[PDB]
Design a protein around this ligand. Structure first.
Ligand SMILES: Nc1nc2c(ncn2[C@@H]2O[C@H](COP(=O)(O)OP(=O)(O)OP(=O)(O)O)[C@@H](O)[C@H]2O)c(=O)[nH]1
Ligand SMILES: Nc1ncnc2c1ncn2[C@@H]1O[C@H](COP(=O)(O)OP(=O)(O)CP(=O)(O)O)[C@@H](O)[C@H]1O
Ligand SMILES: Nc1nc2c(ncn2[C@@H]2O[C@H](COP(=O)(O)OP(=O)(O)O)[C@@H](O)[C@H]2O)c(=O)[nH]1
Ligand SMILES: [Ca+2]
Ligand SMILES: [Ca+2]
Ligand SMILES: [Ca+2]
Ligand SMILES: [Mg+2]
Ligand SMILES: [Mg+2]
Ligand SMILES: [Mg+2]
Lengths: 54, 438, 349, 425
């Protein structure tokens, strides 16, 4: 039961008590994912329009 | 002095953000018009509260915050509300139509078209900072914006602000206050793509906040206002060290250093006490031992789970009010002899304690009663993995039938992103079990 | 209308409880994976406790205490007794035991050999028994350890009661099974009816190789013993007969000579782990039936052998006990539209 | 500003649509001349969802009235709230459709459709952020069925990402006009399967049995039947027209009600339904029991014969929201065998403080149940009884259709029936 690193100031204080010792995607890559998904949306909408054109 | 930028995403993030900045202002003596009488340095200063507030020549203290929502009705409340004068219009960003509770819609369809604008508005806040620490990101798991757009924003923030910390306040989905059935999908989709970008995330389960409001505050059917005012007390207790003079958790990096020894396991459990009803005749003021002992009761955890059957990796005690170090240790010793507190062997069995002499501020007319002392315990338990298990199970039930999947595929997302995200969660559950179980 | 689910089809006990529940007309059974339930008759291993108590407007109850395995596991029990100050290492009602890990994997190998060498030098009885979760009784430490190394799981070595109480006629060993029910309020209820699983073979102290007179298990006596069912039907004596025997022979009652120690042991073990497994302030509730096994020596001293977390019942007592489970464990939380069969062991929570 | 464009087509569609605007115009305080005269700001908070605001504070419904003959729409123009409709939004021909799907879809309807879309486009161009469309029509006639689905097809072509909702009256031999109604309904259902996000299946026999057995109307009229549909349409749209802690958005309702794109046919219900013992107060339990009673549902399908994929419930009036949650959880927790277990928490509830006209409180039911397959089975059986003898086909082959298009509609609906069957097991 030890207290360490006791720091005190006008608005409070803080310390540490020890009870026992122990024993990314680049900017270019993110644009590809966004544009890839937008392209799959365009393809699905084109098939719908093509279907409606038939 | 180093600045922190807060980002509120979606309805949950924006409304919770509303309650926090309302509370911050009351805590720092800032009026709704931005003026701060106690601030003796007009139009400048490097005081602790300046990490969250900037200052104009006219003496206005402006939050370092951005509010983002794909639909305008929630942020319109901010524009005409009590604190409409705090923020300027550039800080409030709203689209025309929301993500319809569809992760894919917020992340891809709509997010792609507004992400560059959001980064530009954040870059403007960054340009006012002499030493930006990082970001605090508020959002829900269940919403299409809170889930899908947030994960997109986090990816870009890692690109534009590499060396900056990012912490989260995430609302875990609870059916009692949700008419959305696809939230398990969204929760797991946003956890998978945000995991590598968030240094530390504080999950709040609406189920837990809901039952605290009914049990402690005697609210029969709590509202978002009730829930948010309570959540903003926990948030304030967590961010107090950044806004007030102190030596514990003085910068965002310290949260990871003190609470996250392993990167993927960065979801500390929050526990808060006491929560007393203002309508009560008059409550007996609880002692340091009693409020500290309450930190190990499941009934006041932000996530219902049993820490007795997990292991602790870290543990912080954040006290506010009349608390001296002598009494804290007297309560800790009394609790080690009664409670089942099991630490991982590769971690010290101890507690970092912070004490702020200013007691919790309560919103006038709010639900919470003024207390002489309060504590918030941040502990990294493997027991919080119960929430991942509950959520992953609901995911598996719907995905086994592909229910609602077409809504996501129809927005340009591939079906393989589901299993890819689910397999990551299965690995996350495995990491917890390797650390906690024997 | 109350709802429950059955996730352990092999449980004879809760198969009858489910039968009784449906017979009331006020309980309805659901598929084993339906989450909207009041009561879960859960599985033995890997019961998903984390998914309980998260259904809005449902008070959920389960028939197992999360964390009770610490008491119902051979190795766990030893560790619990030696490390818990409530029980202490000097616990007088539990045989001297040690945890021994096979050499192909802390471990108490050296601690055991020290106490062993002490008994060997002091002319004292030095007969131990090795078991785990396949039993070996020997008086040589070399055989006990070599036997565990040939396996691949943890084991425990404890003093073998060389002076057991022998029923007459027969000169035969036995053990006592006590069923204990712990409800959601952590009341400890001891079923008024116990059973003695007796050996139909005369106890032989100079031959531990033939384990038919040393192991009183109902399956060993009914498979390897040649006198099964001679003295009592199914090698199962009930308290009425056993009590009458203790009076005719030993001029004492079962309550005084044995039952006091049994109730004391049950209380000590269950009160010890109460802070770790209590569901008092938990989002769900638990109860559990336990099977305590006791040994009685010739001095009328009771020793604790083990605790079973999923025990079966004697065929003659299924109806009474299963009905008692519904009364104090299920209906107490989910009431329906005596002279209790249990003995409430009061204690301080 | 989440505007909805309303379209009503044919006799049934315009008479039901007329009453709909009559009911909600009353709820929002709009008089027959479009002038507001209510007393609560709640009435105007979401008023632009269904109304356009003209000069002088005049509110004009965002509705388009379509028919292939003039009679029905002259009645509307002369009806109670006839003057409230924008005169330009009356689009009609003179030929009629002879209860013939082919005439509404391919010949007569095709000549008129472009001019309808011109008005639709005009209404959309004045929407700050168009939320989607709703159509009222029957499936047993010619205009609402044939031209109605033709309009849906062209609307989805021009607004592919907008939500398309229909209130579709399903024919029944007991409340029948002509024998060819199964032909027109089978042909329409396939269109709806492909091109709508939500279809509220309203069965005329269910409406009839309710008026006769429950409301004790000795001789029901179409008028009486339409009163039930008005009240039901007002209930389901309460989410959109008034404020509440729920942020109901057409696409959000669809996202949480439709787990599979083709299974978007709903069973609507309403409670209370009281004969004239009409002043009695209705407790929350009674409201909830009735709302889940099959006799209160308007698809004439027994929900106990299937399982609910999803359920949405709207409670109206000043009541115990706590007591609402209790009774709703009681209904699920007492009959969980009729809800699929692979869609967790699939029963959602919304509350609204403003009750309907003349009621302290009410409850509207929206069920996505696999029992709806019974409704498509009836139609399919009636279709095949005639089609196997090619009876009455000349009315359709005379308009350019071929028998093959009938065989394909037949197979399309038997597939829909099969799809509901696999999710019921
Ligand atoms: N605690 C709390 N939770 C909220 C609040 N608002 C919404 N939620 C929760 O958030 C989830 C719904 O997501 P939202 O944040 O409303 O959706 P969104 O982020 O705006 O995304 P959209 O789909 O575009 O609307 C549900 O689980 C709600 O319970 C709030 O103000 N406080
Ligand atoms: N230390 C000891 N001294 C004397 N006998 C012992 C003993 N340990 C075990 N036994 C004998 O072994 C039998 C019980 O063995 P144990 O309970 O360890 O195995 P087990 O758990 O598979 C049986 P169950 O769980 O069904 O009660 C008793 O009949 C007893 O006679
Ligand atoms: N509920 C209701 N059903 C109607 C009404 N008018 C017609 N129907 C039904 O609709 C079908 C006839 O379609 P109808 O609308 O008259 O043909 P259309 O004008 O060419 O679209 C039949 O099944 C009728 O029973 C009405 O006013 N109310
Ligand atoms: Ca200053
Ligand atoms: Ca990073
Ligand atoms: Ca012509
Ligand atoms: Mg939103
Ligand atoms: Mg055993
Ligand atoms: Mg007609």
């Amino acid at each position: 039961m030890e207290v360490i690193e006791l720091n005190k100031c006008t608005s409070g204080q803080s310390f540490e008590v020890i009870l026992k010792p122990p024993s990314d995607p680049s900017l270019e890559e993110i644009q590809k994912k966004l544009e890839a998904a937008e392209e799959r949306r365009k393809y699905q909408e084109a098939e719908l329009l093509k279907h409606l054109a038939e | 002095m180093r600045e922190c930028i807060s980002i509120h995403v979606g309805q949950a993030g924006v409304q919770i953000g509303n309650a926090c900045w309302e509370l911050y202002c009351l805590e720092h003596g800032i009026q709704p018009d931005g003026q701060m009488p106690s601030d003796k340095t007009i139009g400048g200063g490097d005081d602790s509260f300046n990490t969250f507030f900037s200052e104009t020549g006219a003496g206005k203290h402006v939050p370092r915050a951005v509010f983002v929502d794909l639909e305008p009705t929630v942020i319109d409340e901010v524009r005409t509300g009590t604190y409409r004068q705090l923020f300027h219009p550039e800080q409030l960003i709203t689209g025309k139509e929301d993500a319809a509770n569809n992760y894919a819609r917020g992340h891809y369809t709509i997010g792609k078209e507004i992400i560059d604008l959001v980064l530009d508005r954040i870059r403007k806040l960054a340009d006012q900072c002499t030493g930006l620490q990082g970001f605090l990101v508020f959002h829900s798991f269940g919403g299409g914006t809170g889930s899908g757009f947030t994960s997109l924003l986090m990816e870009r923030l890692s690109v534009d602000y590499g060396k900056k910390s990012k912490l989260e306040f995430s609302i875990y989905p609870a059916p009692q206050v949700s008419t959305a059935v696809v939230e398990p999908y969204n929760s797991i989709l946003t956890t998978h793509t945000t995991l590598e970008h968030s240094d530390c995330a504080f999950m709040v389960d609406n189920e837990a906040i809901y039952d605290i409001c009914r049990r402690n505050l005697d609210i029969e059917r709590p509202t978002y206002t009730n829930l948010n005012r309570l959540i903003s007390q926990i948030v304030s207790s967590i961010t107090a060290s950044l806004r007030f003079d102190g030596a514990l958790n003085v910068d965002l990096t310290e949260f990871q250093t003190n609470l996250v020894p392993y990167p993927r396991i960065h979801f500390p459990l929050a526990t808060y006490a006491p929560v007393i009803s203002a309508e009560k005749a008059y409550h007996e003021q609880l002692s340091v031992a009693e409020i500290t002992n309450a930190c190990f009761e499941p009934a006041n955890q932000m996530v219902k789970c049993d820490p007795r059957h997990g292991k602790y990796m870290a543990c912080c005690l954040l006290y506010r009010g009349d608390v001296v170090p002598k009494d804290v240790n007297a309560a800790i010793a009394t609790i080690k002899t009664k409670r089942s507190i099991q630490f991982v062997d590769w971690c010290p069995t101890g507690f970092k304690v912070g004490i702020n002499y200013q007691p919790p501020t309560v919103v006038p007319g709010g639900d919470l009663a003024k207390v002489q002392r309060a504590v918030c315990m941040l502990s990294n338990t493997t027991a919080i993995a119960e929430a991942w298990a509950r959520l992953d199970h609901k995911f598996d039930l719907m995905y086994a039938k592909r229910a609602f999947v077409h809504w996501y595929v129809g927005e340009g997302m591939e079906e393989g992103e589901f299993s890819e995200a689910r397999e990551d969660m299965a690995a996350l559950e495995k990491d917890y079990e390797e650390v906690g179980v024997d | 209308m109350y709802t429950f689910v059955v996730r352990d089809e092999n449980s004879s006990v809760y198969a009858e409880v489910s039968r009784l529940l449906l017979a009331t007309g006020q309980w309805k059974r659901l598929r084993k994976d339906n989450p909207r339930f009041n009561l879960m008759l859960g599985e033995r291993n890997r019961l998903p406790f984390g998914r309980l108590g998260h259904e809005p407007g449902l008070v959920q109850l389960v028939n197992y205490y999360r964390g009770a395995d610490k008491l119902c596991r051979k190795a766990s029990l030893v560790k619990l007794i030696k490390t818990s100050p409530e029980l202490s290492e000097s616990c007088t009602w539990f045989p001297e035991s040690y945890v021994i890990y096979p050499t192909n994997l802390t471990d108490e190998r050296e601690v055991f050999l020290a106490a062993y060498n002490r008994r060997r030098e002091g002319r004292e009885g030095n007969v131990w028994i090795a078991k785990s979760s396949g039993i070996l009784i020997s008086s040589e430490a070399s055989e006990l350890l070599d036997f565990i190394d040939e396996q691949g799981q943890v084991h425990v070595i404890q003093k073998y009661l060389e002076k057991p109480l022998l029923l007459e006629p027969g000169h035969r060993k036995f053990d006592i099974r006590s069923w204990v029910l712990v409800d959601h309020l952590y009341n400890i209820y001891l079923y008024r009816e116990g059973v003695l699983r007796t050996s139909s073979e005369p106890y032989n102290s100079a031959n531990f190789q033939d384990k038919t007179c040393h192991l009183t298990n109902h399956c060993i006596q009914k498979e390897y013993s040649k006198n099964y069912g001679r003295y009592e039907e199914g090698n199962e004596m009930f308290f009425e007969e056993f009590n009458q025997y203790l009076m005719d022979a030993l001029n004492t009652t079962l309550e005084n000579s044995i039952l006091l120690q049994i109730k004391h042991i049950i209380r000590s073990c269950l009160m010890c782990i109460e802070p770790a497994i209590s569901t008092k302030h938990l989002h769900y509730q638990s109860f559990q039936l336990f099977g305590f096994d006791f040994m009685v020596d010739e001095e009328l001293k009771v020793w604790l052998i083990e605790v079973n977390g999923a025990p079966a019942c004697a065929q003659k007592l299924y109806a009474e006990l299963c009905q008692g489970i519904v009364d104090v464990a299920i209906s107490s939380v989910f009431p329906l539209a005596p002279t209790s069969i249990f003995i409430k062991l009061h204690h301080h929570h | 500003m989440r505007e909805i464009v309303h379209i009503q087509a044919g006799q049934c569609g315009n008479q039901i649509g007329a009453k709909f605007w009559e009911v909600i115009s009353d709820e929002h305080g709009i008089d027959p001349t479009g002038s507001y005269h209510g007393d609560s700001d709640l009435q105007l908070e979401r008023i632009n969802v269904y109304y356009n605001e003209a000069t002088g504070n005049k509110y004009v419904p965002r509705a388009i009235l379509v028919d292939l003959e003039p009679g029905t729409m002259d009645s509307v123009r002369s009806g109670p709230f006839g003057q409230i409709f924008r005169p330009d939004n009356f689009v009609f021909g003179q030929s009629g459709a002879g209860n013939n799907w082919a005439k509404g879809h391919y010949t007569e309807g095709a000549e008129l459709v472009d001019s309808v879309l011109d008005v639709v486009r005009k209404e959309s161009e004045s929407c700050d952020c168009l939320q989607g469309f709703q159509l009222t029509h029957s499936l047993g006639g010619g205009t609402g069925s044939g031209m109605g689905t033709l309009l849906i097809s062209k609307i989805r072509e021009e607004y592919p990402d907008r939500i398309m909702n229909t209130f579709s009256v399903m024919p029944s031999p007991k409340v029948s006009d002509t024998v060819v109604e199964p032909y027109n309904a089978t042909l329409s259902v396939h269109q709806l399967v492909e091109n709508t996000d939500e279809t509220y299946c309203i069965d005329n026999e269910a409406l009839y049995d309710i008026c006769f057995r429950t409301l004790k109307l000795t001789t029901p009229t179409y008028g009486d039947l339409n009163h039930l549909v008005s009240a039901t349409m007002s209930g389901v749209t309460t989410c959109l027209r008034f404020p509440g802690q729920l942020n109901a958005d057409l696409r959000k309702l669809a996202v949480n009600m439709v787990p599979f794109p083709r299974l978007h046919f709903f069973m609507p219900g309403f409670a209370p339904l009281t004969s004239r013992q009409q002043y009695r107060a209705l407790t929350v339990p009674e409201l909830t029991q009735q709302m889940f009673d099959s006799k209160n549902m308007m698809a004439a399908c027994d929900p106990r014969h299937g399982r609910y994929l999803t359920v949405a419930a709207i409670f109206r009036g000043r009541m115990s929201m706590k007591e609402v949650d209790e009774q709703m959880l009681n209904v699920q927790n007492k009959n969980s065998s009729y809800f699929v277990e692979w869609i967790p928490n699939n029963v959602k509830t919304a509350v609204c403080d403003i009750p309907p006209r003349g009621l302290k409180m009410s409850a509207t039911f929206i069920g996505n149940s696999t029992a709806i397959q019974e409704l498509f089975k009836r139609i399919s059986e009636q279709f095949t009884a005639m089609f196997r003898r090619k009876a009455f086909l000349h009315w359709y082959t005379g308009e350019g259709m071929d028998e093959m298009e009938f065989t394909e509609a037949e197979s399309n609906m038997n597939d829909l029936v099969s799809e509901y069957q696999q999710y019921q097991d």
